[PDB]
């Protein structure tokens, strides 16, 4: 039986990989960061509250300039906010109100959104006519759009409930690369700072490091017991953190190809909706179903702080590129800026 | 007031955006939201035709009331990842085919289609996001049931059935079997209608059930509950 031989070959290959990973683990992150002075108590405070969304907020994304925000709600509305003055810069009506993701381009010229319509819509912010228009509609996925991220004004990466990811050229509307290998729904994406790699986390409790230019999976990481809902790169690009329904955040190192640290508490039994790092990478911020946000010491795995102030599930997080502020958005239809 | 001329103009723009958002929200609050679920394809498309590739939205108006119906067929993904998007829906319309009791899924031969429909109903009705929302159940193709019950006994799908093999008790048994899956009987109601491919009163039934849901929500708001 050829199929049996292939299955046994796969099993022994997996055993060899696990043995190599075990041979590379001569120490843990906890026994090296043992002598580090602890962070202390992190006490951030609400500086702004953003009102105007009339339904559950699902996504937000900071601009590169660290003033401008885009947030997406089930109103069928995208709002671009000035965070310094709380002014609403733009209000964009959506053709489908079932949005789950939004992205703001690094140049500031475009906004992307999508969701249960299976389509990624690219919106032009800077037109001669003075209004926001639909630049492109990207079709080709057969399941819902869970996350999208720009590489430049012409390239964007999306992940879907197809179990696949796709890299698109915006000008032609065509799917340039397809990333396959997941078995469950892909829920989150994060781009490396140099933009040459992906990490994607899926409902099969696995994360996968992808090469953008070749279209092939470089590495696979496991260890969670349930669906991975959130994933984020360490600021230097050599590690990433994942958040899951099993209530644990995990740190994975690309070069060592292992899991370094686990962030969990006995009093935390809810799923994690979102994760993000600070500029130095020392603090790991995660939003929960407990209606709040936790700040972990990423090197000690200790709980350093709490952001409370949302009356419903914290659905989305962001940290600015210069690290001044945090933005949180929840199902109570509010956005909050924290310093 | 320590603002530039352009800052004041920006605030004026933001205020106009606020008024537009409020107007849109007021219009949104006054429409009925219906989530259309069916196991496979039971009568769902025929229901949509009578009342007139991601989520499909259908708009219509009946007796000065505006209805939005969302069809989540052709979304073959994990339901538990997007079902909470319909937490605030006004009602769930669930379509079940009466003639599909002897037939099989044709993907897995052992399981009857009716048992799959009952499993889907049990998952939807007792779902944590839908604790206090009501279900309008449509039992489709009753006439095609009429031709089949008089030859094929219902015991093929429900061995414990001990009634007569005529349509009144068979249909009553199926309705009772579906309603017995409701494990929250003090919070949500189930409205059952026996329809066909050619019926005009389905929209009237949905209107009456939605009127009851609105009255119940108003009772909860006014403090009589």
């Amino acid at each position: 039986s050829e199929l049996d031989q292939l299955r046994q070959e796969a099993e022994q290959l997996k055993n060899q990989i696990r043995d190599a990973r075990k041979a590379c683990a001569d120490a843990t992150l906890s026994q090296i960061t043992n002598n580090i002075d602890p962070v202390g108590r992190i006490q951030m405070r609400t500086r702004r509250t953003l009102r105007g969304h009339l339904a559950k907020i699902y996504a937000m994304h900071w601009g590169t300039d660290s003033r401008l925000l885009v947030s997406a709600s089930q109103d069928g509305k995208l709002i671009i906010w000035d965070s310094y003055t709380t002014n609403k810069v733009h209000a964009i009506p959506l053709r489908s109100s079932w949005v789950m993701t939004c992205a703001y381009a690094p140049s500031g010229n475009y906004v992307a959104c999508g969701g249960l319509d299976n389509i990624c819509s690219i919106y032009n912010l800077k037109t001669r006519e003075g209004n926001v228009r639909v630049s492109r509609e990207l079709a080709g996925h057969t399941g819902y759009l869970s996350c999208c991220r720009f590489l430049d004004d012409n390239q964007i990466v999306t992940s879907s409930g197809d179990t696949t990811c796709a890299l698109w050229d915006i000008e032609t509307g065509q799917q340039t690369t397809t990333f396959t290998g997941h078995t469950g729904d892909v829920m989150s994406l994060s781009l490396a700072p140099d933009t040459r790699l992906f990490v994607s986390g899926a409902c099969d409790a696995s994360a996968k490091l992808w090469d953008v230019r070749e279209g092939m999976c470089r590495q696979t990481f496991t260890g969670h017991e349930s669906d991975i809902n959130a994933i984020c790169f360490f600021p230097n690009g050599n590690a990433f953190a994942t958040g899951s329904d099993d209530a644990t955040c995990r740190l994975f190192d690309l070069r060592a190809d292992q899991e370094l640290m686990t962030y969990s508490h006995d009093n935390i039994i809810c799923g994690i909706t979102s994760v993000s790092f600070s500029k130095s990478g020392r603090l790991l911020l995660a939003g929960y179903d407990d209606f709040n946000c936790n700040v972990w010491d990423a090197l000690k795995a200790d709980r350093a702080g709490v952001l409370a102030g949302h009356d419903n599930r914290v659905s989305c997080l962001g940290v600015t590129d210069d690290g001044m502020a945090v933005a949180t958005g929840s199902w109570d239809s509010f956005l909050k800026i924290w310093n | 007031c320590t603002l530039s001329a352009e800052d004041k103009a920006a605030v004026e723009r933001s205020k106009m955006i606020d008024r537009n958002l409020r107007e849109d929200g007021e219009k949104a609050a006054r429409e009925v939201k219906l989530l259309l679920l069916g196991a496979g394809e039971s009568g769902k498309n025929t229901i949509v035709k009578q009342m007139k590739t991601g989520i499909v939205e259908t708009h219509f108006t009946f007796k000065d009331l505006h209805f939005k119906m969302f069809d989540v067929g052709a979304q073959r993904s994990e339901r538990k990842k997007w079902i909470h998007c319909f937490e605030g829906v006004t009602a769930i319309i669930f379509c079940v085919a009466l003639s599909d009791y002897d037939l099989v899924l044709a993907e897995d031969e052992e399981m009857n289609r009716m048992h799959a429909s009952m499993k889907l109903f049990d998952s939807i009705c007792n779902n944590k996001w839908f604790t206090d929302t009501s279900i309008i159940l449509f039992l489709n193709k009753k006439d095609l049931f009429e031709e089949k019950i008089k030859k094929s006994p219902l015991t093929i799908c429900y061995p414990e059935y001990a009634g007569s093999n005529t349509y009144e008790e068979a249909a009553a048994y199926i309705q009772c079997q579906f309603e017995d899956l409701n494990k929250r009987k003090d919070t949500k109601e189930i409205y059952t209608h026996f329809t066909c491919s050619t019926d005009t009163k389905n929209v009237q039934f949905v209107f009456d059930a939605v009127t009851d849901v609105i009255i119940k929500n108003n009772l909860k708001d006014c403090g009589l509950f």
């Epitope: 006519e129 | 001329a5 352009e6």
Partner: single-chain antibody, 234 residues
């Protein structure tokens, strides 16, 4: 394409009433605030009236206050100026100007063609362009100056200076919309720099099409005041 076409200008007797109209095509008229700016035969630009998007705020210059009314009809995309008690000073060419305001926007970015009106028979900031004319040769760099009565730098960090180019026989074109911010469709040769009350526009690798009058404007507070105008020759 963006288009503003103006009508209603002609010879008028003193003390009469005339109504100027500005049809709008190719853009969302309701979103943009609208300004009326006039140029006399002396060729110095003067701001006259402003109507905001939604008609919430209306501003008028002191000279025309009480005799001029500005209104907009958004459904028909038309801007109107009603002028009463016309005086000899009023004779000028009137320009409809488009202007939108939000974080990062570019106001005063499109100007109309203009129409001619002919009449028979202390806290304001003053903007000072010292040099009236500069003879230039193509290929050299040219610096134009604009001194201001008070500092134009607000507590935000914005300096509210605008640079315009008016070519012979054309309407003014925006070049620099805030100090050192370059407009769209404008070559990278033009640059702007300054501090406080002192300002400078630098043109590198000058070309023939640059010949015209260069104006400097402040947008710190109303009324909006223009410079005298610096002319480039040869």
């Amino acid at each position: 394409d963006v288009q503003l076409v103006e009508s209603g200008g002609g010879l008028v007797q003193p003390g009469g009433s005339r109504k100027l109209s500005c049809s709008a095509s190719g853009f969302a008229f309701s979103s943009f605030g609208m300004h009326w700016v006039r140029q006399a035969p002396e060729k110095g630009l003067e701001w006259v009236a402003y109507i905001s998007s939604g008609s919430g705020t209306i501003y008028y210059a002191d000279t025309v206050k009480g005799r001029f009314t500005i209104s907009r009809d958004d459904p028909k995309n038309t801007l109107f100026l009603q002028m009463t008690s016309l005086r000899s000073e009023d004779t000028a060419m009137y320009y409809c100007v488009r202007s939108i305001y939000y974080y990062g926007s570019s106001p005063f970015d499109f100007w109309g063609q203009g129409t001619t009106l002919t009449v028979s028979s202390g806290s304001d900031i003053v903007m000072t362009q010292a040099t009236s004319s500069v003879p230039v040769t193509p290929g050299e760099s040219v610096s134009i100056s604009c001194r201001s009565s008070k500092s134009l730098l607000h507590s935000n960090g914005n300096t509210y200076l605008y640079w315009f180019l008016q070519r012979p026989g054309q309407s003014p074109q925006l070049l620099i919309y805030r100090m050192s911010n370059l407009a769209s469709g404008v070559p990278d040769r033009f640059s702007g720099s300054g501090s406080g009350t002192a300002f400078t526009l630098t043109i590198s690798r000058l070309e023939a099409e640059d010949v015209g009058v260069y104006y400097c404007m402040q947008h710190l507070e109303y009324p909006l005041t223009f410079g005298a105008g610096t002319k480039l020759e040869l």
